[PDB]
Amino acid sequence: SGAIYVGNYRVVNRHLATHNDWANLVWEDSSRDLLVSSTTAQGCDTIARCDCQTGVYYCSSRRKHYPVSFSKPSLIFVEASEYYPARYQSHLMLAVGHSEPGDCGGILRCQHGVVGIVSTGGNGLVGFADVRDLLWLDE
Ligand SMILES: COc1cccc(Cl)c1NC(=O)N1CCC[C@H](C(N)=O)C1
Ligand SMILES: [Zn+2]
Secondary structure, three states: OOOEEEOOEEEEEHHHOOHHHHHOEEEEEOOOOEEEEEOOOOOOOOEOOOOOOEEEEEEOOOOEEEEEEEOOOEEEEEOOOOOOOOEEEEEEEEEEOOOOHHHOOOEEEEOOEEEEEEEEEEOOEEEEEEOOOOHHHHO
16 A cells, blocks of 8 residues: 655556545546546655655555666556556566565655555566656646
8 A cells, every 4th residue: 555645646557546536537547557547735746856766665564665767667467466457567666576466555765755556466566657748746
């Protein structure tokens, strides 16, 4: 679980969005596993606007932060789950790191701010849904 809070927006994994997120929907993209909803209170986070390929992510299944080197946002095949049929997920970045299904939502940050959130994983891999291209989050 986990979310980014920036301005009057809450960014979450689309497969974990609540009834309240859908009732306050701003934008969603199943192919990116992202959903953004509106909030009344001002958020706490800053979004990176960069091309960093190193950062630190929060891993809830270890209660620990880990450093990672991650690939540029790309179209990656993701196996069928209870949430989605087998498909290509876009704007996804892969890294070597520990992750478990309940780790989705953990924030990946670089020196410039929030880069994205955990969205996929398996066998010593972790995938992050990028948010750096969503320029409208800052306005
Ligand atoms: C952090 O996720 C994992 C880590 C280790 C093992 C596994 Cl099987 C996962 N589960 C996943 O990758 N997904 C299940 C939930 C939805 C995901 C998606 N974006 O399509 C895919
Ligand atoms: Zn950066």
